[PDB]
């Protein structure tokens with residue numbers, strides 16, 4: 001990651017604790033497919 | 036003759052002295068079952084190398100020139116360049132083929148073993164139990180004489196064609212499988228497995244549909260999913276050994292493994308376990324199976340004659356045991372003792388200890404803890420100017436297991452320390468703030484957010500001083516919280532938080548999240564709004580309406596941890612949904628013949644369905660069209676016959692294999708004949724990625 005936009009965040013967008021949703025049950029025993 | 040001798044296969048007097056023990060562990064036995072297991076293990080690892088080990092993805096994981104943070108077990112180890120890594124995986128494939136066909140067995144076993152562990156130790160984020168098991172089996176099979184029956188090496192050497200093998204070859208494998216089952220069972224005697232919390236949502240799969248005819252969903256998720264697993268683990272440990280219980284054990288174990296294969300994405304673990312299950316049968320089952328065939332098949336299948344004498348066994352007449360027999364007996368005893376001890380060796384390596392025990396992979400604690408992360412904040416302070424900034428949570432990383440282990444956090448901090456000077460930051464101080472909950476508890480911090488991880492102290496054999504304890508006293512609250520989870524509308528959402536004394540949480544509610552409220556469940560907290568610098572102390576059962584679009588802070592000011600909750604709804608999504616419903620109602624009214632009046636021009640694109648020769652649609656129209664298209668696509672996906680799905684699956688796997696092979700060939704050519712011009716490389720790489728069709 002480069003361009004100084006994927007390696008830095010502003011204050012307000014880095015402290016947003018609550019995010020709405022419309023993994024949460026990861027077991028660490030599952031191979032994650034990539035392609 | 037003695038019943039104990041018949042059941043256990045050996046007499047007590049055989050263990051009176053060391054020499055008798057060596058003779059017992061080196062007695063003759065048939066080689067057939069070992070050969071079949073060798074073949075199946077080799078075939079499965081051959082299929083597994085291009086899929087899970089990462090040969091297809093190796094061109095985007097160890098890419099040259101990319102700056103990434105690695106997580107190796109030892110800091111000395113570093114990846115080689117890409118081409119040499121492809122060569123290493125080629126050697127792995129050749130070793131697996133050699134093990135499958137039994138051609139140059141020891142060399143093939145070594146060529147599979149050494150690269151596999153090199154790759155395994157190079158990254159701790161790719162560790163899982165089914166990989167450690169494969170490594171251990173490859174380590175074991177290097178010493179066993181598994182090429183004596185149904186092997187190419189037999190055809191090339193008469194002395195090793197249908198010959199005897201020592202008994203400890205079977206004993207080590209049987210002990211390994213028994214240890215796996217039994218340790219998995221005993222590890223699952225935890226409060227979060229016997230009470231129904233781990234894997235609480237796996238009872239909704241359609242494979243459990245028949246059980247619902249006689250049991251409710253709540254009971255089906257406890258008696259069958261949880262207790263059944265524990266009982267099957269222990270019993271499958273014990274049942275297969277004895278002759279009386281082998282049939283029922285095989286049936287239950289096979290059903291268990293097939294269901295695990297369908298439910299999860301573990302990979303080849305279930306098939307390897309299925310192949311290992313027959314190993315408890317009599318050592319001569321393939322021979323009698325070959326006998327029970329027509330003569331035409333016998334002309335192609337392996338030999339059916341009795342095995343010949345070998346040189347790696349002690350024969351009773353007597354024969355004085357040599358050196359290899361004693362080494363085999365010692366290896367068996369010491370290896371089994373080490374396998375018993377290692378899963379419980381977490382009191383020595385306390386640096387790797389956390390809320391759970393040790394690094395994942397070598398404990399057999401499968402599907403016993405589930406984690407849900409809420410937020411990850413990484414702060415940095417520059418050592419020259421004093422500026423304070425925030426980094427992206429997962430920059431310069433490929434896996435997300437660094438949020439739960441201290442050592443990986445230390446390695447990530449050092450990597451960031453060496454890499455940030457490229458982006459105009461001097462010697463920094465980096466702080467981490469990570470929230471995580473295990474098995475649906477209150478979300479609490481895992482590392483102290485006031486400690487510079489770059490200068491923190493960590494050694495493997497001492498306890499880490501900056502890992503917050505797991506507050507297990509709030510475990511029963513998971514009952515009440517669930518009730519609160521079921522009292523909400525279809526729009527409202529709830530997040531539960533438990534915070535330590537002294538610390539504070541600073542939060543920025545987004546402008547979209549209107550109607551956000553904070554309620555206190557236990558303890559004493561103070562909520563501060565910085566817009567006017569006003570702080571209020573909240574007592575038990577008090578609720579406050581937070582501002583939307585500003586900063587607020589919550590401080591804990593009690594001798595004990597404080598538990599509270601955020602209840603919020605998204606106003607923007609609600610308004611958009613109302614407008615979308617109104618637009619759909621207007622469309623339906625137009626369609627059914629009502630609303631005879633002319634449609635507005637903004638509605639005309641909706642009926643037309645295509646933006647051609649007109650003004651660009653408003654965001655609402657674009658959103659409606661996108662939602663309709665997505666719903667239609669999902670509906671089309673659902674109405675797909677089985678054969679098409681199977682064909683697509685096969686084509687995708689063929690694509691993976693073809694890409695792996697072509698990339699490996701390109702890498703080997705680059706190593707041997709040198710690197711051609713960039714245009715030729717681009718053409719070859721483009722040809723490699725092409726879909727089969």
Ligand SMILES: C/C(=C\Cc1c(C)c(O)c2ccccc2c1O)CCC[C@H](C)CCC[C@H](C)CCCC(C)C
Pocket residue numbers: 215216219258259260261263264267268287290291294295299301304305308401402
């Ligand atoms: C997910 C489960 C266990 C985790 C697991 C996995 C994934 C493995 O790969 C293992 C491999 C070897 C050793 C242990 C492993 C392991 O622990 C329980 C799965 C529960 C199952 C699907 C429910 C069916 C239970 C039995 C078969 C039926 C009993 C029903 C009534 C008759 C009582």
Ligand SMILES: *[C@@H]1O[C@H](CO)[C@@H](O[C@@H]2O[C@H](CO)[C@@H](O)[C@H](O)[C@H]2NC(C)=O)[C@H](O)[C@H]1NC(C)=O
Pocket residue numbers: 527550551552602603604
């Ligand atoms: C915001 O406040 C809460 C959610 O944060 C919700 O209000 C509820 O108000 C309705 C009004 O009839 C009650 O029936 C519910 O029982 C309330 N829910 C509770 C108390 O949890 C609603 O999402 C928003 N309400 C307003 C007025 O904006």
Ligand SMILES: *[C@@H]1O[C@H](CO)[C@@H](O[C@@H]2O[C@H](CO)[C@@H](O)[C@H](O)[C@H]2NC(C)=O)[C@H](O)[C@H]1NC(C)=O
Pocket residue numbers: 537539561563568569570590
């Ligand atoms: C609101 O109340 C909080 C309660 O802690 C005050 O916080 C402390 O803030 C002072 C500086 O104002 C620090 O020196 C203390 O260390 C803080 N205490 C803790 C426990 O963190 C806060 O200052 C108050 N705000 C206003 C505007 O009066």
Ligand SMILES: *[C@@H]1O[C@H](CO)[C@@H](O[C@@H]2O[C@H](CO)[C@@H](O)[C@H](O)[C@H]2NC(C)=O)[C@H](O)[C@H]1NC(C)=O
Pocket residue numbers: 018019020545547548605606607608611658
């Ligand atoms: C709150 O709800 C809104 C509803 O729009 C969510 O918004 C979308 O947010 C994503 C980014 O997460 C944007 O790219 C989309 O354009 C938004 N949709 C629109 C404008 O229709 C939003 O993510 C939710 N969460 C927060 C924190 O605002």
Ligand SMILES: *[C@@H]1O[C@H](CO)[C@@H](O)[C@H](O)[C@H]1NC(C)=O
Pocket residue numbers: 004457458459
């Ligand atoms: C500032 O950072 C950017 C990104 O690397 C680049 O302009 C340069 O490295 C830095 N320039 C100065 C003057 O520090």
